[PDB]
Amino acid sequence: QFEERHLKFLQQLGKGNFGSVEMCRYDPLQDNTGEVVAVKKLQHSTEEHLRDFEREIEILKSLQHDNIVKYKGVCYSNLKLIMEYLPYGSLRDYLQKHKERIDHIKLLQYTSQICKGMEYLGTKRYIHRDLATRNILVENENRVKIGDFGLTKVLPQDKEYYKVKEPGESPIFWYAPESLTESKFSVASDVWSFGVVLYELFTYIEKSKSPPAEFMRMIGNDKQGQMIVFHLIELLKNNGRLPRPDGCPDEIYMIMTECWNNNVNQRPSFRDLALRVDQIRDQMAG
Template identity: 30%
Template sequence: MATENYVAELIQYAQRTGSEVIFEEVSSEGPDHEKKFTQRVVCNGEVYPEGVGRSKRQAKRNAAEHALRGLLEKQPASNVVNSQSVNDNSFEETNFKGILNHHCQKKSLAHNYIQVNRSGLPQSLQFTYKVVIEDKEYPVGEGKTIKQAQQNAAQHAWSALQEQSDWDSKVSLRSTVSEDDDPPMMPSTSTSTSTSTSTSTSTSLEPTKSSSQSEPMSTSDSIVFMDSSNPLKDQVAVENEGRADSVSNTPTKSRFTSQFDSIKSLGKGSYGHVYEVREILLNKKYALKIVRGKKKIIRKALREVKALSDLHHTNIVRYYTCWMEDTGYKQNSSADSTSSQESSPQFLYIQMELCGSKTLRHWINERNTRTLPDSNRRHESLTIAQQIVSGVEYIHFKKLIHRDLKPANIMFGQDRAVKIGDFGLVTADDVDDENPMERTNKSGTFSYMAPEQKLENIYDRKVDIFAFGLIYFELLWKMSTGHERGKVFGDARNQKFPKEFPLSQEEQIMKSMLCKEPKQRAEASALKAELEKLAHTLNPQKTEHQQNVTV
């Protein structure tokens, strides 16, 4: 086998033979800088040799290689599918374009085929196409016809999708040998056929086995590809999709209106509304976010929920629970209490820690309106910065990237501690992977994006460090609005600070965060140590750095 895309080849084998393929994570051992991962493949109940690698992806690829070698050794010579035949004839065997079209329709993803090149003489034309899904480009495919090039491009995109960290924990597809673009038929699963007797369902975030795992499908024209290395991947989204489709029309009392009262609006966005509520049983106040929308919107909101559910830190907004209802809360315009409900495709209720109404953006703007120099601003800014970096360090420790750090997404808790919130763009950090995952560029807020986040598809957690450097500068330096702010902020992005900037120690720390090259930027842990040194220098009497801040 002369290719390293063993996972894709194994999936193609399973498609042709109707096999059940399961990737199992066996172990992960060693310190972070020397960690080794071990995975194995179970095909139709038979266990194949383990694959070891310095990342989960590498271990998975090696496990797939071992399984392929074992499987192909058992096949008659006439049936062996080598890498050359896969590359040359895959468009004749499997309709990847139809499979990809069906996937995008199911996930409500916009996708398109774009011609990259057309070369050669009329009798030997060569076409090159690429697939673009939700503004993300995938590897190009070549062919002697437009259809062949598009099929090969679809195959590359399909293989790349299956490698992504947010891939569904299981995918079931019908194999096809036609070149029609009709989507393949999807076998029924328990999530789409189950019935529900309640319109309000509590969502569990604990990993669970689906019925397809306990009772594997074994139809002759299907591939069952299940990845058990992360059973939580999109499990909540899959379960909720099934529940939303099978909800009973029997009216039931809303969990929201039955468990909470003293409901006050805190703000409204394009996809939902945030309320301050009191849980009746505990007599305690919370923030409750109601996300309204179709499956795509709910899925994005669930990404934030799943990230928050794993984060327990004093400087990160705390998540408590979530659930689905088929009706949304409609606030009475003349009172704070509820009196009616409205129908909607889906509603996700997210219960979180209640923070103050003012964000760090309000804090900065208020300080900038003061005419006289504020002698406390340097000390307060340092206290805030220390709490931000503490939260960022923890996020990175959990192998996540926030991707949208900015003052508007940083709040103050009831105890006035700094709280990082809005994890709607959070993604996994695969820094240990020798082949970094491609990401969507320009995800976040443009003025706070790191250079590579604006221009490249490959970046890591250091984008959060760059944004933090800009936030720290805003905390310290009074800026007016308009053109002047744009110029000063733009200079800061290039490590250029105003001549009047008097704080040499802070300037050096910020420069270490605003390096153009990500590898030259300081880690959050190193920044935390530097800020602690600075705090001790400025006020040696204070050993605790996280003091209350005047909001």
């Protein structure tokens, strides 16, 4: 267990969907040699949010995979989540800064790694509901892990989707059509969101070309609030889609579009996605 009082703040790391994450030193000997860790805490520690956060903790805790940020422990008073600190930040920021000097062999290594993290997630009947480069952490040049399980849901035994009311703030531009119209979330809607993560990676996080900027362009920048969703549904219903990023290999663009399939059952599995992505990296390499 970790004791609250030995956590020494160093710096903020970031805010996610409902909390905050700090860089801290667990230094129980006060001589300043202790382990640097990542720490999550609730900004608005409601009784509602406190349940979801402990639910979040219990999900992370139960997930052990090379491509899923490690759980280390909790602190009691209100709860704090202790996690491994990954020094390179979010993939969104790392790729944005180091643009294009990250070649395609690298993007596909991360892609592969993302796929495997999700395949295992799904093996435990969990649905992330927020797969996005900003929620993916970089350990080092050669490793990313999936993180921020704040919006994750377990499937019921006999259902294969999870229907949510009442929705909080929602990454709509990553949402598959049936999540927007019906609030059905599933392994399949995470696969849709994975297609957008792949789009993100191959745009190198150019800000003019992000999903929000581009979907907003397509439906009209004049669309506001609730209407954005109305027009997005219609757009997606008619095969309005994010364009192929400048320079994107062709068989990477096909993976994107296969994921963004209105027909829910016709989307690839992560098992097939991981195989496919690894196959492309083989031939690139030779």
